[PDB]
Write a protein that binds this ligand. Structure first.
Ligand SMILES: Cc1cc2nc3c(=O)[nH]c(=O)nc-3n(C[C@H](O)[C@H](O)[C@H](O)COP(=O)(O)O)c2cc1C
Ligand SMILES: Cc1cc2nc3c(=O)[nH]c(=O)nc-3n(C[C@H](O)[C@H](O)[C@H](O)COP(=O)(O)O)c2cc1C
Lengths: 373, 376
């Protein structure tokens, strides 16, 4: 079984290749990680396994979901340490994803009702709604375009959060630059319309993520830095006119950073869209084109590649066997299977997941109440 | 069970409110209605039930899917006749949906590889791909913007198709003005940008659908005409900056036509988006469940006549839609694909067979089309 072969991610000896994909679960009450998260990650922790935490706030103005954990305060560092130690007791490697939602925020999630920040003043259209603390869905407000100085401050927020993650005991961090969030709002030409060095061309649109990656590498080392992007996903009105060229531009920039710094990044993480036969009301793409895009980016990048999005046991085995990726991270499957690692090894049946309990703030039901084999 | 209380849709005494939603299935090989369609509809016809056929071509240009039936030729009329008689033999009411895809087509689907027609020259973006005859997915080409005289030609195609449907024995027709096709390409301000009397204001953007509905009303009577719209669905890059205003403006014209004609239309059919909790990678549209429900009732209250609701409805949702007064009839889609006796299953609260998306839009007359089992 290819998925259970030893792999060397730098200085880490992984026993298998299944990874817990970063998934927001909204269980960190008052933006503070709780004891529920520790048991949540321990259940999915295995000897030599690789885990990625949910999107974690880097600043008070980076939340777009209710009760998401932060790592930008001293108190949150202490709570994360008890979770990391619990995971490390199982002999697993865990990274913390740094997440800034950008314009995908709301007044209820911003301090003193401040306007969300983004690359431009264009908001998210009415096609998308934002989940509210009371369970309803609200309208995305108009963001405020940030200047050159404020951009350097957001990069500083990434640097400090990475330092806090290492202080919390994490083995590394993952930069969330996908799914139409703050970094992805600078990369996609459908959102980026600035007339300065951060927009107007393919090279300029990638300047924000380069400074984010360079600062965190300069703080904790490239070997403890991961990057996640998704040029083919138009979540929250983040379509690109040429996902192929945008992906290659990002991949080329990462290679330049590695050569300049003389070090290899931890990995590259890319999610892909997956399409099925939809009706007219449901509302979509070419699967072969998406598969080719993943192969092209993997070939261009120099280092470990991680694929995600719609992958299963059979799909993951083929990806590793054909060399399309080094690691596979699973999402919704890990929600319903705390022991998904051993279930894949034994080809055991997989428990179904409940979408109504992906979010919400119950420590037990839909979060850790699912049973093992 | 309010879904099984009788409802009087004009002259038709329907024994229940479970409606077969229109669904393209790609079994009418070379646009000719096959005998498989008659088997497909016979399994699903019920005494006092209302059926709506798949989208049907009105001209050689209206094609955007493989092997979709036409009703623009007399040969297709006689093939359609055998299907209608079989459906009528089981005491069911059947309407034929007239469908023009507009810019949602390809050269392979057009005569002589001609460019598809639309309200604008803007194509559908790369976010969507069109199913190909060989099973792959291609790109949407650049459409051709039509003029005033060509708009009247398309209206004439709707009228001739409406006459042929009645000639085939259909109890009526439904105008497909939804899901980002030709009529929706005139309605949505995210697509329509014409400077003439067909673009700009709400009045101009509703002008095209008004002509189509009025022409078929003047041909076969308003009592045999239905209209389907989707103001709140962004299928194929068809979004409006104010879907609720657009739906009300459309309803306003329908009411005016009924007063002018002196008779009511068969019904108003509306499809709503449906939302669940998705992940970030799935990129599925996430809106407000309450907002869509309030839009549907607002269209229902504004319109004077029968209202048919569709999109993500179940047995419980369908029951509550009728009970609350939010709709008179409920049309079901994907569930009707895998459950030929869906009306019986809803009555008894029986288990529902799962549907195979792979056999959607395939060409086999039996596999995934008429081989779904009945209740034992
Ligand atoms: C509930 C949920 C929350 C998620 N949150 C994030 C997130 O915060 N950041 C991110 O990069 N991806 C997020 N994802 C996407 C996952 O990382 C992963 O790509 C996705 O689950 C698709 O993989 P799958 O086919 O196994 O479900 C989330 C997915 C789900 C289902
Ligand atoms: C395979 C398939 C084909 C469809 N074809 C059409 C069509 O040709 N015209 C139309 O107006 N709606 C079409 N629809 C939409 C349905 O009529 C209906 O509005 C929608 O599927 C809601 O179905 P549900 O109640 O099962 O959720 C189609 C849906 C599916 C799944």
């Amino acid at each position: 079984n290819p998925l259970f072969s030893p792999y060397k991610m730098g200085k880490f000896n992984l026993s298998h290749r299944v990874v817990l994909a970063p998934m927001t679960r909204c269980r960190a009450l008052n933006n503070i990680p709780q004891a529920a998260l520790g048991e949540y990650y321990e259940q999915r922790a295995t000897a030599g396994g690789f885990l990625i935490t949910e999107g974690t706030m880097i600043s008070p103005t980076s939340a777009g979901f209710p009760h998401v954990p932060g790592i930008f305060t001293k108190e949150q560092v202490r709570e994360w340490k008890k979770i990391v130690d619990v995971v490390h007791a199982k002999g697993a490697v865990i990274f913390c994803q740094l997440w800034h939602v950008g314009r995908a925020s709301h007044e209820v999630y911003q301090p003193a009702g401040a306007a969300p920040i983004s690359s431009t003043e264009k908001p998210i259209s009415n096609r998308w709604r934002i989940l509210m603390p009371d369970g309803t869905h609200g309208i995305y407000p108009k963001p405020r375009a940030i200047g050159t100085y404020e951009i350097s401050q957001v990069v500083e927020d990434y640097r400090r959060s990475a330092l806090n993650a290492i202080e919390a005991g994490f083995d590394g961090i993952e930069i969330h630059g996908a799914h139409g969030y703050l970094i992805d709002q600078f990369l996609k030409d459908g959102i980026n319309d600035r007339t300065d060095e951060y927009g107007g061309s393919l090279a300029n649109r990638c300047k924000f993520i380069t400074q984010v990656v360079q600062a965190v590498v300069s703080a904790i080392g490239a070997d403890r830095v991961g990057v996640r992007v998704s040029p083919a996903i138009d979540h929250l009105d983040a379509m690109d006119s040429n996902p192929l060229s945008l992906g290659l531009a990002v991949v080329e920039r990462l290679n330049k950073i590695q050569l300049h710094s003389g070090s290899k990044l931890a990995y590259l993480h890319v999610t892909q869209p997956r399409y099925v036969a939809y009706g007219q009301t449901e509302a979509l793409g070419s699967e072969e084109e998406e598969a080719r895009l993943m192969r092209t980016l993997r070939n261009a990048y120099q280092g470990t590649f991680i694929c995600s999005g719609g992958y299963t046991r059979e799909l993951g085995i083929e990806a590793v066997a054909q060399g399309d990726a080094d690691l596979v991270s699973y999402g919704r499957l890990f929600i319903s299977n705390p022991d998904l690692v051993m279930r894949i090894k034994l080809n055991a049946p997989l428990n179904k997941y409940n979408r109504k309990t992906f979010y919400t703030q119950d420590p037990v039901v839909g979060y850790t109440d699912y049973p093992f084999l």
